[PDB]
Amino acid sequence: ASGVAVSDGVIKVFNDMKVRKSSTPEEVKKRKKAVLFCLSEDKKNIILEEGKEILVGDVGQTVDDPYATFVKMLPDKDCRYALYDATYETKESKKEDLVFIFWAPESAPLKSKMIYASSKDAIKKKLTGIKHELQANCYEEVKDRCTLAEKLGGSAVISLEGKPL
Amino acid sequence: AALVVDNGSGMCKAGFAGDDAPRAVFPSIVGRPRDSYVGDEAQSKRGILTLKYPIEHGIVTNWDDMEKIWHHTFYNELRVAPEEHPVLLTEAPLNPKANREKMTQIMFETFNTPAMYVAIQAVLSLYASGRTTGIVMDSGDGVTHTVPIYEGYALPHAILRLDLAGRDLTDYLMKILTERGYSFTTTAEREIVRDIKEKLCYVALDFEQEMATAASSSSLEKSYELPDGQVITIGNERFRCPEALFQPSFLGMESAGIHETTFNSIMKCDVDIRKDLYANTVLSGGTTMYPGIADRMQKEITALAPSTMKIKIIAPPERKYSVWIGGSILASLSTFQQMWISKQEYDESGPSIVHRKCF
Amino acid sequence: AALVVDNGSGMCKAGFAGDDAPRAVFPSIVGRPRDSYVGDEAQSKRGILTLKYPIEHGIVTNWDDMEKIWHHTFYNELRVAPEEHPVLLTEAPLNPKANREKMTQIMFETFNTPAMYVAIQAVLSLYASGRTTGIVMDSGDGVTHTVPIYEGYALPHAILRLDLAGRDLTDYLMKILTERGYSFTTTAEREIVRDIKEKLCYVALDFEQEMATAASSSSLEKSYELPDGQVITIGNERFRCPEALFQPSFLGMESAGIHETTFNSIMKCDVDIRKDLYANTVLSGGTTMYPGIADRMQKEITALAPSTMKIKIIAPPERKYSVWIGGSILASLSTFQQMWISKQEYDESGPSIVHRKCF
Amino acid sequence: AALVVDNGSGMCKAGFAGDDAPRAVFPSIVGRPRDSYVGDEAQSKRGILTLKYPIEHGIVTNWDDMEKIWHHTFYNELRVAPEEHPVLLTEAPLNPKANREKMTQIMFETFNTPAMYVAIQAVLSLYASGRTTGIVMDSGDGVTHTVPIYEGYALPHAILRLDLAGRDLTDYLMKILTERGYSFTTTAEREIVRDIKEKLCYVALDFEQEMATAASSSSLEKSYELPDGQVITIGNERFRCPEALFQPSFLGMESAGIHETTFNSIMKCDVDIRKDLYANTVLSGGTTMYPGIADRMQKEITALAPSTMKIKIIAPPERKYSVWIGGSILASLSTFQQMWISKQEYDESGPSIVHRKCF
């Protein structure tokens, strides 16, 4: 509990990501498939990392699979908060749930790891409705599609982003 | 894009009209500390909170908790605004008329749904099988119903209710697994036993013959891996747990089995239509997904029915979600758009309009 | 400029918030003649006085002597005024609630600290590694703790305490160094053996294979020269001394090793969360600084855990002072200034305020 | 002279029919090196051995180790030949029929007893209190059972099992005595803590009120002398250790207390007999010997039961060995000699004779 609060920009972005409003397909393409959150310069608020986001419209035209490109956006030596809209298919349902991803690599500086870990339980309480959490502490624990599928529904998941495992 | 919600006694099925399978299937529980968790959130905390079933036996008993489940359904599970999509609700058989108006009032005043509709779960199961006349043995989580239907209308005087379903079988499997040395008592361990029941349990055609087979060899034993990596072995408990459906005395229950309940509800109908109900027995619900349950039901009802009657048990492969899939197809039809209860129509006639528009 | 004090079982770490390493690291001892000496002063007199540990096993037992250590810490070691700086204290797992209020009462009444805060040592170690869920096996001077943590909250029913740590290993090394003819019995000689242990001891992956290697050649011998001119040559004692951690029977102790203690504490948690604890085992404390201890724990726990579980032992390079460094980072944050227990709040709520603000 | 053997979960009671008290009372453990020690022999070696409970939870799980216990019972404890005396065995409630045939087979072939009999522990306790209808709260070493009995027949569908008994209370006392600075971790120190529990612990009528009383004075403190001559003082731990029976959350358990388990098992019976079970609640087992447990159970159940029902908790002074003394009186009757299962009858009907002669 480091007291780091969540900026209103992150809350607004999460609200659009969670609840889908009926909109024209042009606005549907502007929906965020994935987004990264980072500490501010003064380390007082959780803010949106500018330029680090994946749009639904980018999927299928410039982005072939949404997960591997999202992993590439993760810094190698820095901690980051992530929100991934996972579209997967189970043996008896096609599900679309948000995944809160805690990226804290071992190569990250000690100061970054301590602040992000201690403030994770505060930001996740503000983002109500998220039922999946992925804590990755190395590149191996986040780059694999089967790792995300195991967290989503375990062995019951048969597809992820429209591609079989 | 309409919404289809199947408010089951133990599991809530939700999705969009036109889809083949429900998007969200979560337990219908509300958890409060021993401040309020709904669905899988209430099961993630395990033992700190106490869980309550608002629709425990298909009939809603706590309307304050059901308003939380519907709110959790639209925003957290379906991730849509209920004010922008018409919602199709399903109701259990023998639902009191007071409850039907309550769902209409909640949908239009709290969630502000543009349109709304109520359908009977048993009728949707029968229609999904291509039938309008027959008897539906809808065995769910907390309640088992045998609903004889003639020309699309259920016969209320012949509908029988059995408080014996998958919830009681999961508790019985937990009890008989302790005879092998295992210990499943906690809420988390109850979900593991439920997964064992859904994967390894089956109905034996001849229970006494099957018991002798399991006591003379190990060909019926199966291995299951726990979430912590431990592997357990289950033997004769595979067919003993679902045997309580046909022998409720295994649970200390004084009622009859699902085969006699189906036969008794047939005998409560008109004698001229009993021949049609014998050959049109349709299984529905999750508790009817045990392999060999259709062959066992066929054998048991045959021993009860007259020898000249043709007994035919219908077990469609998609009978687990036949209520929801039937509703989704119906709600996606362009010709069904005139059957909705509009908000304008609700403002004039009030909640009582559901009786004349949805019967 | 806040103060961070880590009250360890045998070593007291203190410093200022924002610094990378503690400024003062001195033994937490009180010496009285066989009139009161604390820290290195009590060890400088050697054998004339008798030394007592007030916090011997992580839990403060003699509150009168623990006050002197705090007085020595603030005035003699940190050379700072207690009333001008908020102080962040650390507590061992399973610390009784009665002790927590006593630390708050002493800080506000004796030292008149403007602000106060208590943190769990195991949680700070886990947070410093970038984890909110995991098990921290904290091996210090007088006690070893395996503390499973889930979302930042330690599970008290699964916390296991082992009375086997570096203090016992130092005594064990002295006992086995006498088999080679060297003599170490005095208090001054004990500190020499401790320096030997911290520099030449290592954990062997295979103990029996390593023993054969040391008995067939001299490649494992590392000649250590004492402050005087004897120049001992420690051979197989390099890996025999830390082997007592995994084989406590070497010390005549019936308790299990650190690998079995970690596994037993995992098995006391929920079966759902055991998978996450296996892959998030974090080492902390000075006694975990032997080279090869992470690999040995990985091999030992794997033989205990199911083969389908992924065992991952995390040994950060800074794990010796991970408790203090984690506290220093937290106490130096501008947003953390709202979580201090102010003196105005202690005056209203009394010593019981710490239970709500520090959990 | 018949033999009466009470196979408890943690302690084995043996003796002769007609005696007032069992001759031999030894722990039911089997010790093997970390080659076979049973009873007090396995506890005399302390930590050099690993101890296993073959009947850990009232139900036999390791039949190979049980034969060692029975062999130790007859020859080393009773000092008699099994082939010269009939033996009366006691079984836990909900004992599978497969186990009952196994005990019959073992005593007739391995020990060659002339006669043999099986009795239910709960029914023997109820009979010893002069009742045929009632509910028995049998709390022993490793398991606690609530067995409702109507006209001498236990109701299997309403029997509830709680894995919380004296063994878990001894460990909890060990855990909370370390908060006072004491160290009880070894097997030898566990027997000392067990003696402290059996002599100084009591059940507080009002737990919260008693904690305030113990926090304001020293009238509730008691002194105990260790076998080595030392003296320790225990305070509020006297009533906190048995409080885990009514608040299992003290041990991290999600299960309900003994008062709620008794109430839940009553509510699982027929509505007409619940009135008789409320006024005929009989306590049995060693763990029910805490002073004040009958008054606490009376108050706790009363708050659960309707105010119009009469709650009467029966706590006979001999309830620690009510199962054995009930068996010894029954086995010593001349009219009971026709109820034995003879070897001649076993040679004809096989192990299945026990189902028709002992029910």
Ligand SMILES: Nc1ncnc2c1ncn2[C@@H]1O[C@H](COP(=O)(O)OP(=O)(O)O)[C@@H](O)[C@H]1O
């Ligand atoms: N494959 C399966 N085999 C046996 N039982 C199942 C299977 N799948 C689900 N069930 C059982 O069905 C029950 C709920 O099914 P469902 O009919 O959807 O519930 P509801 O009562 O809400 O309609 C669960 O308790 C579960 O134990």
Ligand SMILES: Nc1ncnc2c1ncn2[C@@H]1O[C@H](COP(=O)(O)OP(=O)(O)O)[C@@H](O)[C@H]1O
């Ligand atoms: N490099 C090292 N190798 C082995 N042991 C060490 C090393 N450094 C410190 N220790 C041991 O760690 C013990 C105390 O370390 P620490 O974790 O600070 O104790 P505490 O947590 O009780 O304050 C000392 O007794 C010392 O023997």
Ligand SMILES: Nc1ncnc2c1ncn2[C@@H]1O[C@H](COP(=O)(O)OP(=O)(O)O)[C@@H](O)[C@H]1O
């Ligand atoms: N006077 C007493 N007060 C409290 N506990 C007791 C007393 N006597 C025995 N016990 C406890 O009862 C437990 C088991 O007794 P018993 O009923 O013989 O168990 P079992 O039925 O499993 O043989 C022991 O662990 C012991 O701690």
Ligand SMILES: [Mg+2]
């Ligand atoms: Mg249903």
Ligand SMILES: [Mg+2]
């Ligand atoms: Mg420490």
Ligand SMILES: [Mg+2]
């Ligand atoms: Mg007993």
